[model samples]
Target: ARPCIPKSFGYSSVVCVCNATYCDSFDPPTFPALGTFSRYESTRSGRRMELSMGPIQANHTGTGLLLTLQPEQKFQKVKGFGGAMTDAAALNILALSPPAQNLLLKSYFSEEGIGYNIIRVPMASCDFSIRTYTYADTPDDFQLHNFSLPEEDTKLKIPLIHRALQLAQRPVSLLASPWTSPTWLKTNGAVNGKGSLKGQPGDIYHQTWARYFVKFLDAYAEHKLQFWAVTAENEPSAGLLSGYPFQCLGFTPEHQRDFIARDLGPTLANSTHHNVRLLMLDDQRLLLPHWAKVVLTDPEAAKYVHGIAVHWYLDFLAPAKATLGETHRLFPNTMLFASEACVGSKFWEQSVRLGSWDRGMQYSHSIITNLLYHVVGWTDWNLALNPEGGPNWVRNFVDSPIIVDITKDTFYKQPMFYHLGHFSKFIPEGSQRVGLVASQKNDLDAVALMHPDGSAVVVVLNRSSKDVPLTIKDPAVGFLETISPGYSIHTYLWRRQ
Candidate 1:
């Protein structure tokens, strides 16, 4: 693995800088022998994936904080973790020198890097694009004869996606979400603000809109890219509010239900891409249970939806237990995916906060919280962005894990990247969340998982000011004791004896 080229910025103490040939990588942890464990730590003080190994003692001190792992009790199987490949991410990446671009891609998708097995793809021009556009832009062309992917997709997004697929060790699942329909197909005749499909479900307008999805799949298929899933819309509720700025299309629970049952579901079912999983309510958790209840209660719509897609913007106002847990209980068979998330998107905040460890904790906190509530996977908003946080058409800028500085021909991997690695690197797809019993008075936030190879993976976060000393006990094996540094996260792995 390459060493971090540390650079200090005003907002963050350090960020790992990478150029053409010197990008850093975290090697995948080797499963320790029967009597030992490996630990990887990323501290707020600037350490990233610091590695160490220790032995498991036969006798416990019966002191400190004890975390007992229950391997036999497993919950949801992890689908995977990744970031979106928005047009801006593609653009920023392409701005780098050819060799530097490959370095950035390898930094995310290669086995030597954090293994990202899932990637989100925006269907058309979202706010992250250089400009707003739709596949079928020609007005009044109901048959969509003018429908064709813009250069953003064909020239930018597809090439990077192909490279990512090649770099990944396993099949990278792609999930697509559309920000809005074309102006001609909307009631307001615009891409942004309050707009609905020009006609109700079962009508020509709705049917045409549904066909629009099929067309997108077909277009990507020409490039040999297959999507594993697609959301009904991106933040569907945004369309219901007046003066909402950015690409959007409104869909009430009832409207979305009818559209899925009478239009999208049937259309996709008859198309060649019928196996593509369909998700509903690509919105915030504040709408959960209510949204899931309304759309999923109907048999016609429920049968077509494979999961629920949620955003992180409103998570603070809505408790995960009531929103995420309740939805899981109400619809046990349907998977829950935290689809889009980014920091610095709020109006009062700066677009990017380079090297902010707090931003990194925010990601780990959300991922752990969501996973605790039966969410199968988590997908971040942008894979990469410019120094200013965007090439956003609407100026709705947001921070990304990797920020490309084209002027310098380098990219900075923020602390958020390492925080994500604490989980994404250790807990891969097919890993099952196992039971972890933490002793009371524990200052650490933690979760445990059992990998397919019978190795135990435990992630612990010490956000408190004081360091935490803890004992990790796997009943089947012996126990290991360690100190979790304050304002840091650690991933511990060991094979079952």
Candidate 2:
């Protein structure tokens, strides 16, 4: 494997020289002035601004802070960025008045919003739901005769998704994950705790579960919705949900491999929704390498999987880059996605802490670091939550970028919302990750991309307590300069003239 490239290019070296043979030598493409969109939450003022050049001019001389680039050095193609619209999120959105609902939607799905292109939804009930549920609850229905769509979803979840799709005006990828199978099919005979499948591998119960995924696809198609992907299960290697108050079905590596190989894999291969991708282990990143190896090494199981879903909580346990890199090294063909992320609260009372800049910075750092690693897309936990982050029946509440006040019929956009926009708005899908080398300064993090439209986006995050000079160079063009304020994130866009 190629060693991870070193950061901080030498000052004398030129950065980002275009391939002369491929790029027409006829007087290189004219360079347009670099434009910047920045967000600073540490300030008392709002978080957004359009920053013009800040106290520095382009320099060909070696006397400046420099970030060298090899735009030609490219890697993975991006899928896109987005958030989840769970039953709780949908219910909260509908709880608001029509005018307020429109405002919230405009902030998320519209051109004016974060420009999200992906969303994750639960197949049945998870911690983020109002109550326990399943599309097929009938006992021993081998042919799925009793499978039916829940009215709550048809009314709340489907309507919200339809509206979002209309607003996006582009292809939106939907990924569905199940937290638990029907209680009767689990070893514990209950839905909301750590349980295993009732029967052994290749049993009727296991086969029916695979058919269950197909039924979900068919049911959603009735409302004109097509899923982009589905996971084997949410947190396949999870622990007991003792005090967590929700469904958690554990799947050992062997169990997941067997089910995917013998059941889900072949079922999807024969189904009408064969194009729908199957992702495995929608859980924390720390479990990735071993878990991914278990499934990917098995030719039978690997055949059906399109990718892996990772969560952010692993940042609490390990550095995301190494964990992600290990998975990438072993299974380079499998796509990697950041499936779900949020600041969970143990006590429900503190779930929605308004105007917290700390949360915004946390999101910015996570987004930047994950993207710098191999993550192709990042999906937040919820689009909107009530003031207390609930309608969550189990009292398990968490923060959201947008918090709705049902009584006031209003919503407040958090600093995290703008920070998210800095990436999702400028770094459109289909953009390729390009080579970028910057100082290995501990406080700064960055990633560069080349958009399908021929524009370039460079995103930087400054975690220091003081402002620092920043420079970006393109030998084909000239240099661009700016001062990155402490504790802020900025997105610089360069359009080739």
Candidate 3:
């Protein structure tokens, strides 16, 4: 009466009794199929893919859209997908009863769910915190002898995160980013709104900020939490933007390069933190080729950097697809990741939309485009938010896939949740993004990847108002056709030949 373990689970040569928390229902109601197909879609008339779906076909070919899948030709290897664990996210989760909180954690980290394997944590307080505070509040302790993790974090963020790790079973990669340095080191003498690190050319503040990073890694280690990566700063270019609504520490390209090359890079090379992969430009894609080029080109900085973390806020302002392409072209060896993204704030109303399929599509489109342009992994902004979208100190409200109904003692997994699962659950970590020779169709966008299990997955999005016939061909899988109704997205899967 229970679903059989998937071949991909791969606990070989031994019988295992573990059953996944949730298993997706398939059309034919069978697995180990010659191939398998699944979808989670939303249409204008409200033909929800979650509500109902039937067997899709692949055969008759025509000029509608000819997508050629080059399974043999691969691009960046996918790392994984996940959400942020911010102060507010922790506070909201902690507010729930124990039983309800476990349900929330399992919903995300369990195999029964989207199976997110990556997580992002704020080093200090960010815009989402109830207030701005740093790990070491007593400034001028440049020796960092008095440095300590904030009490708010110990009571809120730490415990729940450890629980999340236990629920996951598999190892999780935590990426840490700082929104502001300790106040005394900044020129503005405040952790809020806008400030820059105070330091003359030979100032120890630059080196002190570098040591600050090591202090964080060491403290988190004391708590048994290990960071897999750290960003230089949340948005190094934010100070240039006028009236940005959060605690922002600005770093110019030159300043950032100097910090990394002369201070952070050298200190890290000599410290136990050397293993922690450093990420650059935790900002938008517009800075592109130049932002990445500057550091990656520097022998000292390039030696220390593992990847470039990009944001989605300025995706429209810049040619993001082109930006990613150029960045990849320039730094072929460096990994690229969509570090943070969400739909809310003035982008959406103060209240959360109970179930918005259109919102999910926005995520799908951005994800599809970013992947096509050479991103390896994607991390959403927050794992959860309240009905109002936040408990942000600056009132910068934003939506998350899992929205808590605090009054009801429950959480709602929005349509965006399934949209993320469409890719995260299927493509998986270690999957290699393959080339897709897609025909020009203004309304359609798609990308494909070959899983480590030798299975291939293709994701397609139809933003038009009419259903589009799609004929996807791969020599190994033959030709597959399906109807991608307007305003819908689908992920097609098949076994390797």
Candidate 4:
């Protein structure tokens, strides 16, 4: 099982990243020397360029939203994609499940606000879903055919998610991950605190676990649901510390590669499921290279995988991306997706969880950084939690944009909600992440997209508590000047009238 982090994990003030732990000397601009990003800049105005995308992504990527960047061997772009975890179980707790889920679902389908096309779902639970529950019918046995989703999903998550997809009326992508698996499947056979998978009956376990996915697909397919991407495990390195336990396994690269390629891949093929790609590496960002060796070496595993999955736990995304650049260049087919991140004070150095987590702005900064790294998708962790944060074994991690009290029917939006809206609602799937340079001393981190019309949309993130003086030579969105700080995120839309 996973770690059990209590609700009060880290309630202290977030010591600035510029502190001793982060090392004040490290500046993002000088990353390559500090070791991550080399030098990156955008094409100025009048420089003809294009990043191809589709209905959601194509037009968005090139002109609305799709995902194909022009590869003239010279032009570069960041393809835009969005993902979020929705709180369904929590809604059920309040007995307002149907209505609450409906609102959330409709929000995605309708264009009234920031719409999110891509989504991430924890398989059973971690600290996200309502009080770490699982669908394992069997209690003490780690056997196949003993898996099933709770009936609650039928009423809470499924209806809303299905409704939202229907509303968007577009076939957006879904990424399924498990913060932790079922307690019965782990060495501890209990779902609390950090525990490890026994890895017994390798073939049986692999087949059984893979079956969890196959079954999920089969079930959702009945609900007209299909996921675009899935990682074998969420937080592959989950058992490192403790708090919030269930569904965890400790596997080296060799173990994962063989299990996935030899076991999981073949399993998927045997089933009717097609186009569902298996992404490797759902561990903390710092451990990427360790996972890469296995992913790249095995031809069978490499062939079956669609991309390399990564996270932002440690600030090693850029470095990991750079290290994998050669592999990526060679394996052009293998895309990059940044799976999960949040502003929690999460680290092994700290023994307990803290509430002094960074605000949404902190998440926004990391988000832009992820985009710049050519991360095709980005997802925030814990869609919703209780007011106390979690029933975790550790302690406090900040609550997400949505928080519901226990089974209370009422839920409130957190700052991260609006922050996410700025992108999800406007930047449709497949939107190409074109370059937009920020002026020196101006805290403008931007990604440009050609909207449905002739004009373009530029999503900007301004960090400081002041204004970011934004200026582009051609001005896609008719001169967006200074952007306010304090969680100021904007999806500025324009046209070439």
Candidate 5:
């Protein structure tokens, strides 16, 4: 249990700079203007040699601010705010197929790797799970029966899912939401894609529906497991009944809010699951404004809601981040969670893929933008997926960080996996989101951590094609450095002492 080193750098903590013969002479193949941060350290692990980040810069700021600042004055900055919102400790991911679970568990959940500790359960079903099922029939079935936890999910879902959760070194969050209800309950009586809720018989469906929620809780308690939150079914608006999935129902803004305030919030009184929160709105970013309007307008609907959950259907980073940020600003009290993000390798054009730097740039930018939106948690859509990309009912095929060949009993980790590894591995659950600033917008993205030792750790992601010299101006962190773009993610730690 020494310490985590950059693998690229030889030192665990010490720079060991005494101008030693073998160590100090190592130049690390420096590039001329790769920024002051482009300096490299060598290691004897037989790993290839490379440059690394220099410390931060406070001497220079932007013109208005930078030029106006007294050379010695402290620079002010903006830091995104975030706090915990779910009982789910860490995200629990699922493997598309069975055999893949073994590899995922060993690599991802083990103490040696990046483990996603929070997990999601499909109430009835979701596009990602075995199949759809629900406790109640659609259109308000009063006598909700025929409800039995099919041994199917228990067979596929329980064994692997349970094993992964138990193996993680951390507590896990278990959240559940139904994807769709039975086709008979939908207006079209078909759950293949889209259709509206038959609301078939509203009230009778009501009493028993509440009973359904209670029943699941009871089931979990019986199994000695507790759900952290019961999410409103997957995107109710995705294709009428089409996109969301089987056994799913979509309520108009009025219907959804009224249902929650009048029925949902009331059903939880005196319940052991009282602390359990309700996560809502799992949809494309475009739908955020609409959901925000509904939730913001209703007092009760807003009251019981733990937070708004979202998916990554929109690839445009800035606009999506702003959309969520706007919603966050409007409902300052409400929290935001990114429930599902997938690997749409198609999103990036051929031009962006050939260059390793471009792929790296895109990945870092995404994480930074999402974090900026006041999002408390970010979850990737798949823990592992099939060779063709998914069990997707739609079959359009997408990617996940880890791709497991169910048949091969093997897995492949993509660049995205390593990029995410940096976050899930270093940043702890309760860690605060502190000041992160940058000069020359496109050159880099910044997030800083004030280490207890008066030194600060700042991460800079250079998205620009060329190596950018960044001047991080903060009286607190007196660092001046140039950061190189090896796909441009540099962590500069400045010690004030």
Candidate 6:
């Protein structure tokens, strides 16, 4: 095990510093023997992934807070957890020394690390890029002969993605989302701010716009990188609403439905990339069932869509159960995915809170809540960013779990990174969320999963100021009593004989 080099930024916890030769990493313990259990804990006070083992005892007659695991009752199968490979993230990572870059990649994707298996990629450029750009820029080129991958992809994003794929233990699923179409094809004649496809569906402009997506897939295919999924657009409402300054393309539910049915859907169905999954409504939760109903009510568009992509921006305004639950209820077949999330993205917040344990708590809270509501996977925004939280073209900075300090030739893994690990590290793909019932509601929140190998993983979070005592009862196996420290998270792993 490599030890964490702790560095304080005046917050509640210390960030783990990683240089070329040394970076923090811990091997996951093997599945416990029959009647035995293992626990990994990370606390706000300063314990980073501390491991402990204990034997499960026979059923007890009394308990303070008992959590009963019902493996028979299963919910959604988790797809995976990961972060985006935005231009800013790639640029910041490339800024480091060669060995340092390898250490950072190993820290996130290798088996010894958190083992991220899903990666979201921007099609061309977003706010995270240093400048706005598109694959096709020639005026009135309906054939898209000018379409090609930008330097950002060939030299930066693709190379890093290839390396990450090599490091990952499993096949990394890649999903691409376009911030906006080419400037020449937009009604506003610009890439940023309010704009829509210049013509109606089936028209030359809209047809060419749909073809633009396939061209992107084709270009990346040359590099042997085929995406697993693609979103219709990123935050479509951002383009419709004035005063929202960013790269976006507007699409009301009706407009999106028409385009998907008449243009993009047919185009991709007939293309070599027909197998790629298409997700729609890459926006906030506030537009849940209504947005889903509008697009899915039309069978033509519904046939082309495989899932709904949601962002975490407006989660505060829209409750999870009402939005995520209602959407899943309305469209049982369509998957619910939490596509993009980050801290400090709001207007008044600081870009980076280096050692904020509260930020870590926020991640656990969101992931657990979303999982309970049927979200199969959670994807964070940027994998890594500079200490300033950006190289954003619009200066829209946001905090990332990992922050690169080019000046120091080092990178820091913040508390949020470890919080995410509590889930991603333990729950592999195909793991199902089993029913975990708490005897009584208290200050603690927990979720249970049954892995493919039949090992059970339970994650408990205590956000309150005081530690809480609890007993985990898996009747078939045994029960274990423990205390969850204040403002801490714990992952318990055990197998049923």
Give the Cα-based TM-score of candidate 4 against the true structure: 0.71
- On lDDT, who's better, 1 or 3? 1
Misplaced by over 4 Å in model 6 are none
What is the C-alpha lDDT profile of model 4 across 1-497, one tens digit per residue?
11111133244222211111111111111111111111111111110011111111111111111212221112123334454554433452234455554444443344543355666766665544545566664765455456666755666667656666766644567788765556656665666556655563246666677777788788778888888878877766666456544446555667678877877788887888867888888766576555776676788887778777777766744464654454455555666677776554455333222233235455556666666655666676655555565534345445555455435454444445545555555455555556555334444556655444334555566555554333333332123222233335655444434
Task: Please give, for residues 1-497, the per-residue lDDT of candidate 5 as tens digits.
Answer: 11222211221111111111111112211123322333221112211123355544546544421201122322212212111111111122232233334545544554455555556666655554434445554444555556556553444555555676676665667767666655555566655565654453235444455557777777767766777677766675664543543345676656667767766666764467778888777666677667778865888777788777777666564386457867876776677777765555354532111112233345556666666566666666556555466555444455555545334444544445444544444444543445554433454565554433334444556555565544555464454635344344654433454
- Model 3 regions more than 4 Å off: 1-31, 35-63, 200-202, 240-245, 347-351, 439-442
Candidate 2 lDDT over residue span 319-350, tens digit each: 76568888888888898988988875544335
Q: What's the CA error at residue 444 for candidate 4, in Å?
A: 2.8
In model 1, the number of clashes is 0
lDDT of 4 at 445: 59
lDDT of candidate 4 vs native? 0.53
Q: After superposition, how far is residue 89 of candidate 3 from its true place, in Å?
A: 0.5
Candidate 1 matches the true fold with a TM-score of 0.99
Report the C-alpha displacement of residue 6, candidate 6, in angstroms.
1.2
Candidate 3 local accuracy as lDDT?
0.76
Local error of candidate 4 at residue 168 (angstroms): 3.0
Worst-scoring 10-residue span by lDDT in model 4: 41-50
Q: Would you list the clashing residue pairs of candidate 6?
A: none
Error of 3 at 166 (Å): 1.7
Consecutive 10-residue window with the lowest summed lDDT within model 3: 8-17
Q: Estimate each model's TM-score.
A: 0.99, 0.89, 0.89, 0.71, 0.73, 0.98
Each candidate's clash count: 0, 0, 4, 60, 34, 0
Per-residue lDDT of 1-497 in model 1, one digit per residue for the tens? 77788887876457899998789887755787889999998887878888899999888976578999999997899998999999999999999999999989988898888888889999898999878899999888889899998889989999999999999986799999999999998999999999989879999999999999999999999999999999999999999999989999999999999999999999999999999999999899999899999999899999999999999999989999999999989999999999999999988778898988889988988988988889999998899999899989988889999999998999999988888888888887899998999876777789899998889999998888798888999998989889999898999999896
Residue 481 lDDT, candidate 1, scale 0-100: 88
